[model samples]
Target: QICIGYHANNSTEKVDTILERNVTVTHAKDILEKTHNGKLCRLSGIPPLELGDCSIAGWLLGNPECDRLLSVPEWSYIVEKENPTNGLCYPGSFNDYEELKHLLTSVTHFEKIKILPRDQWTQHTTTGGSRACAVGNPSFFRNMVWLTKKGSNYPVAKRSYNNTSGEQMLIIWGIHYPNDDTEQRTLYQNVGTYVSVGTSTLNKRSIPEIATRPKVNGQGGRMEFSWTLLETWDVINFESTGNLIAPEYGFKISKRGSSGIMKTEKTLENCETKCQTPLGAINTTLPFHNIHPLTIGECPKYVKSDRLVLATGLRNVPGLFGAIAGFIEGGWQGMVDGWYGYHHSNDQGSGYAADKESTQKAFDGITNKVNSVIAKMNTQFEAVGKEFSNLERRLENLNKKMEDGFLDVWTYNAELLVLMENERTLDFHDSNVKNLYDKVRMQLRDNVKELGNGCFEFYHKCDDECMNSVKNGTYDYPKYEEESK
Candidate 1:
């Protein structure tokens, strides 16, 4: 028997696509279609069950339970699970696995569907699939809908939120490339990470960092991962990681449906993938069998940023290195300038560094002079910051004035809506009013001969408040007048 459970939408509960092992997949397809009455509109492409609990590594989703199903080493199991060296052991049969995969990709055009890593039994939660969140940093995991930059606004089947801070973030694992065709593509190229600021909305951004490494080809390993290493502007702004790339496995979810479905390299030797790192040299290490810089043992980390997990990529950023270089140079320059300036004031004769008193005089004078430069920057920065704040406040109020003006216009449209409703309602009464005009004119002209003088009255002389109101060219139906009569 096969009962597949899936997690989607914003639901915390798991939903099942119940089926029998004996039934053909098309037969099971009908069940998915009917049962999806309460699910997201993605039915079709429920392939035969592949991994039973015992198939997963005992180290991961409880080895004791999974090991009994398929005894595999944790590392071997992870690598082997993706594109198995031999044909995979499909629970319903192996050919059905590839056949169904073909049916999904070629026939049904289902894109890349991943149902691995998740034990067939555990349907998962609001996080969509088990890997829908970062294996590590899943900040405020509530909604699981991926915000598409374009197209169908339908809530995606998988994806978690990075909405903990006011500035929302997308912790991209690496630079996206042209791959799938049905998904069209993106703007020229894509940034590894992006924060949803007011584009010209002051957005500046990150993620909990998923610890469990999924995907067969995304960057990074157990020691480090490719986070949204900060993105910046005309097209977009700043990701973290100073300037480096991603880990090997993957993160763009829809592209890789399951965790570790594709096998990248096994060890540090087989890694040859490279995307964008930045533009610099000297200290910037060349890419090789590594995702980021070739640090000896542990990965480089700079935890001072707001995220606290702002791990430095060790690519080309000069934070720690800049500190050391600036201190040593500033000290040397101050002394040299003081020595030269004092000699210049006393008629510019060359003096050796051995000239202690004269050199000392130059040192004091130049030190004071350089000190003013720092003082100059310190005050200028404050002034610019003050102006930025003032501009921000000014622009916000100006926008409010425009927004309120739209509201005023919206209210005016409501009054116009009333006239629209009035036309529909009064159309019925207008026919009756016109009925009287037609009859009165006919009665006056047909019954009495006219030399075109003007005055004509109905021979029957029928009159009432209703007629009087209609003759006055208004809709003043009086209920009291009718009731009294």
Candidate 2:
């Protein structure tokens, strides 16, 4: 018969004082505040990492020619200054951009009308613009329409039109040539899932090497002195977190990032007068930094505090949970003798019992640290999944409208929804949309995506049941709960 064994050292006296001492009491605030790179920048200049070939950054910014017309100069001016209170803020550029984005992928309730054409590009000049535009049709603009390198002219192409003055615009979509260049893209959607385990554990290690001096060959080959400034903590005991959790796990969750310094090969000329001695000290995003979770017994179950640490721009949904679960379960099982003991009861029994009991403890005092981490990981995955799925649906609808053949400027904005594309082909349509939108489309998508990614965790805070569920990093008590059935 097999036996379940225990060491006397496993007593409460040795329940792991590491949590009290080395574990450190870190709130999401502390982690985020003390972290390396948490600032916003217009041009970070950080080199993009590629998963398959093309970098996500390169794809997003590849086409500089992909510009849309400045929505009413007045609107453009307000946006340029970021003046929030301007009356031109309704169908704000960004807002309009998003609404139209939906038109590209799905049927829209917006108006699509056709009128006359003053230009020769439009095929149905006699049929007039009013009748040519419709919610669905061919020869109109597609959401992802590629402007002909030889587009005749105008700020946009009009596949449809309305008999108004103002034209709504489309989101600027562009990519570097060779879509295959982006294979296995590290782009947010195309990239494989990455669970934010304790930053230190996954790639934890610290190395010390002799600093070197810069060589000033010309003015007397004096060596410029150098010093170490960064260290790696691949083995940490923190959690993963963000706004993408609630929609995913049906609970509020947060996690901690790893803490470490970047000891560079060089040093400040004047440490006391220059920047913070360490790169991480001055900016959380120091170069060449990595973190991960440590071994079992080192982490906590659910987030210990209600504080938030990092601000990743991702949505929340169920798919995230599936990914998180797959990672944790597989990783956990692997550490316990790999597949050698996949059938053993000790690993399974202990894993379950520990998770259940720990999760029952007080703030940071109890909880299955693995489950907590896994919950956080999966939630992010699901959130991202939901966002991409919605984008795909929107694209599908826009394609249908383009195939319907009602190309004109009057219904152009409502038809193909290429707020910009229509403007380019305006001369072709005698009529145009009058003040088609209150705002712009691209900006709207960006702002909403940001807001949604940020407050996702707070969604659970709005309801009572979700609040309680937050305690376990799950939607309800464990599946074994009698009443849960």
Candidate 3:
């Protein structure tokens, strides 16, 4: 048997059949023809022969079908032949096969082929060489050599297609549509499974290029730029415990000594300046006035000074509510109500009482009643103020911990609580003052006749008792009934 064998494309290594001395030409043709598996199956180091050859040597040397074959193989090497000019001639000459074969295998060499402007990168042809097809371009040609080194290649593939190995060559990743133009760029991934790889967009200049740029004084000429990694964007799947991906990104500058510049606001508080409210104190107002004046006091008998006259006026002596009520109830008559009510108990005991002990007890009752009401109101206001303060503090703290949307709500409500506290405080003061005026005025009005008659009776009785005491020369104070009219 004559030796004959086959192997894969673009490889130099080969396998040969065992030698058989009695093998016929027909037997060789049958064997070689059957050995063809759609790849270049040319005989090693032999010229072409006719297909109908009758000899075993012819069959062994015959031309193989190039159209059906998908790719170049080791046996289909670039053959060199001696030229008439004593120069070596490579393929494409009559002595050697077409030089296009060598050009096809040399990947970068085919870049010279003219790609049609309308169909650019898709349709390629040459003036002397054969046409070419690329893997990413969809055409009637075999797509070969499917692998590339990670990070060194950004591979493209046919649209609406998968590779022969039953894997999708690319999947959708990201898209960019520029604002300046309608054109869009799409990004894709070779596979969905995450892998640890460096990803970056950078401009590189060789070490020689750096040396070429003229430098200042020798010391200032060169400086090395270093990178310090701060943070990374990572992604992982919930199904797996390991980190599926962590891609590296980098920054570079034109100058060797140039580095990254970090920018910050004037202060941390300034970072949120754009989000702050433009409103001022007018927006957060209490429902009532904050100041409370003690208006229940005696009016001056002789208004000598203008200041004193104004001080004892209806507006000042009977302040806010008192002034309004005084105007509605009868001018100065109603205005004097505040003054009379304030000291009616003291005046009655000191000016119109026969028994000093009974007078003292009545004054004590009036003082205790007014004090008890004021004390209860003070406690109520204090408790409410503390409760509101605590609530506002909690809201402010909660706002600090939160981000976006709700922070404004918390701040607004907290301010509202402050307004409410002030409102209630004012209300407490207003209500207590009004009630004190009513109670004092009521007692004064009801006891006016009793106090007048008591004064009259006490003076008359004191005259008689004093005369008797003086006549007997034994002096003693007179006593009156606690319930005397």
Choose the strongest candidate by TM-score: 3
lDDT of 2 at 57: 17
lDDT of each: 0.23, 0.19, 0.20
Q: Which lDDT tens digits does candidate 3 get at residues 363-441?
A: 3643453334223321111000001133368765554444324335534433343334323322332333355334323
Q: For residues 1-485, what per-residue lDDT tens digits would candidate 1 score against the true structure?
A: 00001011221221111111121110000100001011111112222122342222111222122333332111111222332322211111121232223221211111111212223212222122122123353321121111223232222112222222322222322222122222212321223323222233335332223233333323222111122311122122333321111211111211112211212232212221111111111111111111222111111111111111110001110112221112112111222222111111112332212223333443454344333422332110000000112336876677567545644553444334323432332222223223433443443343323222122322222234323332334433232222211
Query: What ranking of all candidate models by TM-score puts the best one first?
Result: 3, 1, 2
Q: Per-residue lDDT of 38-57 in model 2, one digit per residue for the tens?
A: 22111112111111221111
Candidates by lDDT, descending order: 1, 3, 2
Q: Candidate 3 versus the native: TM-score? A: 0.18
- Considering summed lDDT, which 10 consecutive residues are worst modelled in model 1? 27-36
User: Global lDDT for candidate 1?
Assistant: 0.23
Candidate 2 residue spans exceeding 4 A from truth:
1-98, 101-117, 120-377, 381-485
